[PDB]
Amino acid sequence: GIHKQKEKSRLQGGVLVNEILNHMKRATQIPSYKKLIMY
């Protein structure tokens, strides 16, 4: 049952949103977390 219940609207095309992950990659290379040492 990969498909779960829904509460809000959602159309097939909406799946496109997944593309977000791609762009997210960029940030994944350097998030806004807390840094201490570089070496």
mmCIF file of N, CA and C in Angstrom:
data_model
loop_
_atom_site.group_PDB
_atom_site.id
_atom_site.type_symbol
_atom_site.label_atom_id
_atom_site.label_comp_id
_atom_site.label_asym_id
_atom_site.label_seq_id
_atom_site.Cartn_x
_atom_site.Cartn_y
_atom_site.Cartn_z
ATOM 1 N N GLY A 1 0.807 -1.206 0.000
ATOM 2 C CA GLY A 1 0.000 0.000 0.000
ATOM 3 C C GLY A 1 0.843 1.260 0.000
ATOM 4 N N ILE A 2 1.680 1.409 -1.021
ATOM 5 C CA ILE A 2 2.545 2.577 -1.135
ATOM 6 C C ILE A 2 1.733 3.869 -1.085
ATOM 7 N N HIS A 3 0.494 3.800 -1.560
ATOM 8 C CA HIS A 3 -0.387 4.963 -1.568
ATOM 9 C C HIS A 3 -1.043 5.158 -0.204
ATOM 10 N N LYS A 4 -0.853 6.338 0.375
ATOM 11 C CA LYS A 4 -1.426 6.652 1.679
ATOM 12 C C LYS A 4 -2.612 7.602 1.538
ATOM 13 N N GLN A 5 -3.298 7.853 2.648
ATOM 14 C CA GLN A 5 -4.451 8.745 2.647
ATOM 15 C C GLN A 5 -4.022 10.189 2.408
ATOM 16 N N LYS A 6 -4.964 11.014 1.961
ATOM 17 C CA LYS A 6 -4.685 12.420 1.693
ATOM 18 C C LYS A 6 -5.709 13.319 2.379
ATOM 19 N N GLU A 7 -5.315 14.558 2.652
ATOM 20 C CA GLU A 7 -6.200 15.515 3.304
ATOM 21 C C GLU A 7 -6.426 16.738 2.421
ATOM 22 N N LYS A 8 -5.379 17.151 1.713
ATOM 23 C CA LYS A 8 -5.461 18.307 0.830
ATOM 24 C C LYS A 8 -5.511 17.874 -0.632
ATOM 25 N N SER A 9 -5.677 18.842 -1.527
ATOM 26 C CA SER A 9 -5.745 18.559 -2.955
ATOM 27 C C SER A 9 -4.397 18.065 -3.476
ATOM 28 N N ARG A 10 -4.427 17.357 -4.601
ATOM 29 C CA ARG A 10 -3.211 16.826 -5.202
ATOM 30 C C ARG A 10 -3.512 16.155 -6.539
ATOM 31 N N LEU A 11 -2.984 16.728 -7.614
ATOM 32 C CA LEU A 11 -3.198 16.187 -8.952
ATOM 33 C C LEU A 11 -1.948 15.470 -9.456
ATOM 34 N N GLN A 12 -2.120 14.638 -10.477
ATOM 35 C CA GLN A 12 -1.006 13.894 -11.052
ATOM 36 C C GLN A 12 0.181 14.811 -11.318
ATOM 37 N N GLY A 13 -0.047 15.855 -12.108
ATOM 38 C CA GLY A 13 1.014 16.792 -12.426
ATOM 39 C C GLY A 13 1.775 17.246 -11.197
ATOM 40 N N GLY A 14 1.078 17.332 -10.068
ATOM 41 C CA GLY A 14 1.712 17.758 -8.835
ATOM 42 C C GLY A 14 3.015 17.029 -8.570
ATOM 43 N N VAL A 15 3.085 15.773 -8.997
ATOM 44 C CA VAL A 15 4.283 14.966 -8.803
ATOM 45 C C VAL A 15 5.534 15.727 -9.229
ATOM 46 N N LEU A 16 5.383 16.588 -10.229
ATOM 47 C CA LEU A 16 6.501 17.379 -10.733
ATOM 48 C C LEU A 16 7.261 18.036 -9.585
ATOM 49 N N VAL A 17 6.536 18.398 -8.532
ATOM 50 C CA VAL A 17 7.142 19.034 -7.369
ATOM 51 C C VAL A 17 8.382 18.273 -6.909
ATOM 52 N N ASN A 18 8.357 16.956 -7.082
ATOM 53 C CA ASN A 18 9.481 16.112 -6.687
ATOM 54 C C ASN A 18 10.797 16.678 -7.211
ATOM 55 N N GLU A 19 10.739 17.307 -8.382
ATOM 56 C CA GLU A 19 11.927 17.891 -8.993
ATOM 57 C C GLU A 19 12.700 18.734 -7.983
ATOM 58 N N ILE A 20 11.988 19.261 -6.992
ATOM 59 C CA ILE A 20 12.606 20.086 -5.962
ATOM 60 C C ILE A 20 13.875 19.433 -5.424
ATOM 61 N N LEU A 21 13.821 18.120 -5.226
ATOM 62 C CA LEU A 21 14.966 17.375 -4.715
ATOM 63 C C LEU A 21 16.226 17.703 -5.510
ATOM 64 N N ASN A 22 16.095 17.733 -6.833
ATOM 65 C CA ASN A 22 17.223 18.035 -7.705
ATOM 66 C C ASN A 22 17.922 19.319 -7.268
ATOM 67 N N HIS A 23 17.216 20.440 -7.382
ATOM 68 C CA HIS A 23 17.767 21.733 -6.995
ATOM 69 C C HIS A 23 18.333 21.682 -5.579
ATOM 70 N N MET A 24 17.626 20.991 -4.691
ATOM 71 C CA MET A 24 18.057 20.865 -3.303
ATOM 72 C C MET A 24 19.510 20.406 -3.225
ATOM 73 N N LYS A 25 19.932 19.622 -4.211
ATOM 74 C CA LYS A 25 21.298 19.114 -4.255
ATOM 75 C C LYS A 25 22.302 20.237 -4.013
ATOM 76 N N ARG A 26 22.130 21.345 -4.726
ATOM 77 C CA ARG A 26 23.021 22.489 -4.588
ATOM 78 C C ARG A 26 23.233 22.839 -3.119
ATOM 79 N N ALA A 27 22.135 23.080 -2.409
ATOM 80 C CA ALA A 27 22.200 23.424 -0.994
ATOM 81 C C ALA A 27 22.822 22.292 -0.183
ATOM 82 N N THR A 28 22.568 21.058 -0.606
ATOM 83 C CA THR A 28 23.101 19.889 0.083
ATOM 84 C C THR A 28 24.625 19.919 0.116
ATOM 85 N N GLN A 29 25.219 20.661 -0.812
ATOM 86 C CA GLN A 29 26.671 20.774 -0.887
ATOM 87 C C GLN A 29 27.195 21.763 0.148
ATOM 88 N N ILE A 30 26.283 22.519 0.750
ATOM 89 C CA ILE A 30 26.655 23.504 1.760
ATOM 90 C C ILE A 30 25.419 24.132 2.395
ATOM 91 N N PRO A 31 24.835 23.428 3.376
ATOM 92 C CA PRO A 31 23.642 23.899 4.086
ATOM 93 C C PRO A 31 23.937 25.093 4.987
ATOM 94 N N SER A 32 22.911 25.565 5.689
ATOM 95 C CA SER A 32 23.061 26.707 6.585
ATOM 96 C C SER A 32 23.199 26.246 8.033
ATOM 97 N N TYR A 33 23.728 25.043 8.216
ATOM 98 C CA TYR A 33 23.912 24.483 9.551
ATOM 99 C C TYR A 33 25.001 25.234 10.311
ATOM 100 N N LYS A 34 25.366 24.715 11.478
ATOM 101 C CA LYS A 34 26.397 25.331 12.302
ATOM 102 C C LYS A 34 27.761 24.706 12.027
ATOM 103 N N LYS A 35 28.734 25.544 11.688
ATOM 104 C CA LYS A 35 30.085 25.076 11.402
ATOM 105 C C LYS A 35 31.049 25.483 12.512
ATOM 106 N N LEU A 36 32.091 24.683 12.705
ATOM 107 C CA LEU A 36 33.089 24.962 13.734
ATOM 108 C C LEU A 36 34.492 24.985 13.139
ATOM 109 N N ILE A 37 34.980 23.817 12.738
ATOM 110 C CA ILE A 37 36.309 23.704 12.151
ATOM 111 C C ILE A 37 36.225 23.444 10.649
ATOM 112 N N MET A 38 37.226 23.921 9.916
ATOM 113 C CA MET A 38 37.267 23.737 8.470
ATOM 114 C C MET A 38 38.258 22.642 8.089
ATOM 115 N N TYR A 39 39.362 22.569 8.822
ATOM 116 C CA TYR A 39 40.391 21.568 8.560
ATOM 117 C C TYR A 39 39.882 20.168 8.882
#
